[PDB]
Amino acid sequence: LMSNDRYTFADRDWYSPLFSYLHAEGNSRQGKLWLVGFASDKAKSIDIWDKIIELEGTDTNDELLAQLANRATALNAMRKKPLRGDFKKSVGTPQIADIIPHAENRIAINAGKMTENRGYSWQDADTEYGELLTKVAYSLEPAQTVDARLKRGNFISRKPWPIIP
């Protein structure tokens, strides 16, 4: 329920048990893969959710599945980036933390298509952030200089980056 220094609140984690289900038990098969995510800490449950994704078994790229299994750190690194300069223990751009869930939920409809890479890619998923992020850039730089619009243009080129290990 909290966006700490090592976590950023996006959506349910349907990307965790994927570079795993696809190699040990269950494998690739045609049907609807129902995900049940039950969270806990010590003796208190915090959130339980369900989800349904569609698959057929369209090959496997082990590297891309690995990057897909490791996405929350990429979101934390995208949020944590300072606007300018660098400072220790810097939280960084908290309005991006407000707009992460909308682009995440717009992406999350074709989870079964991102899993097998039929037509939707990391780069095709990247384009969804542009509209919300251009809306943010007006507020975070509400100036009327050449430097204002140039900073907005640099700001709209911020994309999450893939991390495998």
Partner 1 sequence: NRGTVDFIASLENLKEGDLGILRKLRGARLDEKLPGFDLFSALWWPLRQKNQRAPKREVAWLIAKLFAEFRFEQREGATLPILMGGICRKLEPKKELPRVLARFDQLASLDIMQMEEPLSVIMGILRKHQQVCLDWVGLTDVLSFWEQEPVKREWSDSFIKAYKI
Partner 2 sequence: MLIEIHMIQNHSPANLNRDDLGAPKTCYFGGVLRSRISSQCIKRSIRTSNDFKALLGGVRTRRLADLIQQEAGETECWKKAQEILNKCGFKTKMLVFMSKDKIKDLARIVLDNSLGLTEAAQQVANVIAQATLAPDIALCGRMLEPNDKDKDKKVKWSNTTVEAALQVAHAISTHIARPEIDYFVAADDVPGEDAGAGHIGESMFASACFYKYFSIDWEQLVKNLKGDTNLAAHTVGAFLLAAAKTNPSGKQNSFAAHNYPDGILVEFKNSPISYANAFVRPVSVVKESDLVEQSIGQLSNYVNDIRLGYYDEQSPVIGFWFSPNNRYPLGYKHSKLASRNIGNLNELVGAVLDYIGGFKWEEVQKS
Task: Give yes or no for a contact between 27 and 18, defined as CB atoms under 8 angstroms apart.
Answer: no
Residue 147 as a binder of partner 1 (CB under 8 A): the answer is yes
Phi/psi at 30 (5° precision): -90, 125
Residue 39 as a binder of partner 1 (CB under 8 A): the answer is no
Site string for partner 2, 90-119 (x = CB under 8 A): ------------------------------
Q: Is the dihedral of CA 74, 76, 79, 84 positive or negative?
A: negative
Token couple for 16: 């965790």
Which range binds partner 1 by CB under 8 A, 29-37, 46-54, 125-133, 147-155?
A: 147-155
Long-range contact list for 124-127, CB < 8 A, 24+ apart?
Answer: 126/159, 126/160
Please count the residues of this chain forming the interface with partner 2, following the rule CB under 8 A: 3
Distance CA 69, CA 165 (A): 9
Residue type, 83: L
Residue 143 as a binder of partner 1 (CB under 8 A): the answer is yes
Which of partner 2, partner 1, none sits in contact with 85, Cβ below 5 to 8 A by type? Answer: partner 2
Which range binds partner 1 by CB under 8 A, 60-68, 110-118, 124-132, 148-156?
A: 148-156
Of 94, 119, 142, 165, the one binding partner 2 (CB under 8 A) is 142
Phi/psi at 23 (5° precision): -145, -20
Other CB atoms within 10 Å distance of the CB of residue 116: 21
Residue 146 as a binder of partner 1 (CB under 8 A): the answer is yes
Which of partner 2, partner 1, none sits in contact with 149, Cβ below 5 to 8 A by type? Answer: partner 1
Which of partner 1, partner 2, none sits in contact with 142, Cβ below 5 to 8 A by type? Answer: partner 2
Distance CA 24, CA 131 (A): 39
Q: Give contact residues for partner 1 (rule: CB under 8 A).
A: 143-150
